[PDB]
C-alpha cells in the first residue's frame, strides 16, 4: 500500500523460501549465494526441504554470542542449484531501535502476508521459551504460531526474523551485518 510493503515485498519476492524440517514450515531469508537464516528452533538437520524439493544441508551454524549467549538465528549452507540475490547492504551495521517496521511471512499457511507492526524496540535480554536470549527486537503486535521466520523489515533494511510472542508483543532475533561477511 505504501513504501514500507514495497521494500518488504521485494525482499520477500525474490530472497524468500518456505523451509521444512521436523520442527514445522519456516520463511526462511536467503541473504546471498547459497546461504540463509531461519531460527535455531527449527532443530535444522543433515537434509531440509526448500519449496518442497529434498535439499542436502551443506553447513549449519547456531550463533551465540560473545558471553556463549543463544542468539536464535542458524546460518545454513543449502546445496541448491542458484543463488540468492545479495542483500547483505540492507542488513544494519549495529543494534538499534526503529519506526515502521514490517513483518512479512509466506508459508503454505501464510501466502504473501504482510503485517504492519510499527516501532520496534531494542529490547535486548529475553527468556525465550526458557531459553536466555540476547539480541531481541520487539513489536507490539499479537503475532501467532506460523510466523516464526518471517522478514522483519523498514524502508531500506532488513533488521530481523521474527522468533517468538507472549500473546501481545512479538520478538526477532537482529540480523547483523557481522554475521554474513
Known amino acids: 500500500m505504501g513504501p514500507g510493503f514495497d521494500f518488504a515485498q521485494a525482499i520477500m519476492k525474490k530472497n524468500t523460501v518456505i ?7 519456516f520463511t526462511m531469508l536467503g541473504v ?3 546461504v540463509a537464516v531461519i531460527p535455531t528452533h527449527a532443530s535444522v538437520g543433515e537434509i531440509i526441504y526448500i519449496n518442497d ?3 542436502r544441508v551443506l553447513d549449519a551454524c547456531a550463533l551465540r554470542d560473545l558471553t556463549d549467549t543463544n542468539l536464535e538465528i542458524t546460518i545454513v549452507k543449502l546445496d541448491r542449484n542458484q543463488k540468492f540475490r545479495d542483500i ?3 542488513l544494519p551495521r549495529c543494534e538499534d531501535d526503529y519506526n515502521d517496521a514490517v ?3 509466506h508459508t503454505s499457511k501464510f ?3 504482510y503485517i504492519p507492526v510499527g516501532q520496534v524496540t531494542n529490547y535486548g535480554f529475553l527468556n525465550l521459551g526458557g531459553t536466555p536470549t540476547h539480541r531481541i527486537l520487539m513489536y507490539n503486535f499479537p503475532t501467532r504460531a506460523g ?9 531500506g533494511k532488513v533488521i530481523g526474523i521474527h522468533v ?6 512479538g520478538f526477532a532475533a537482529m540480523l547483523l551485518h557481522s554475521y554474513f561477511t
Do not use: I, W
Not at 19 to 25: L, M, N, Y
Not at 147 to 155: A, F, L, W
Not at 164 to 169: C, K, R, Y
Open 19 to 25: 523451509a521444512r524440517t521436523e520442527k514445522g514450515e
Open 32 to 34: 546471498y549465494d547459497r
Open 53 to 55: 524439493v529434498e535439499t
Open 88 to 90: 547483505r547492504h540492507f
Open 103 to 105: 513483518l512479512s511471512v
Open 111 to 113: 501466502p504473501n502476508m
Open 147 to 155: 510466523q516464526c521466520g518471517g522478514v522483519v523489515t523498514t524502508t
Open 164 to 169: 517468538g510472542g507472549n500473546g501481545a508483543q
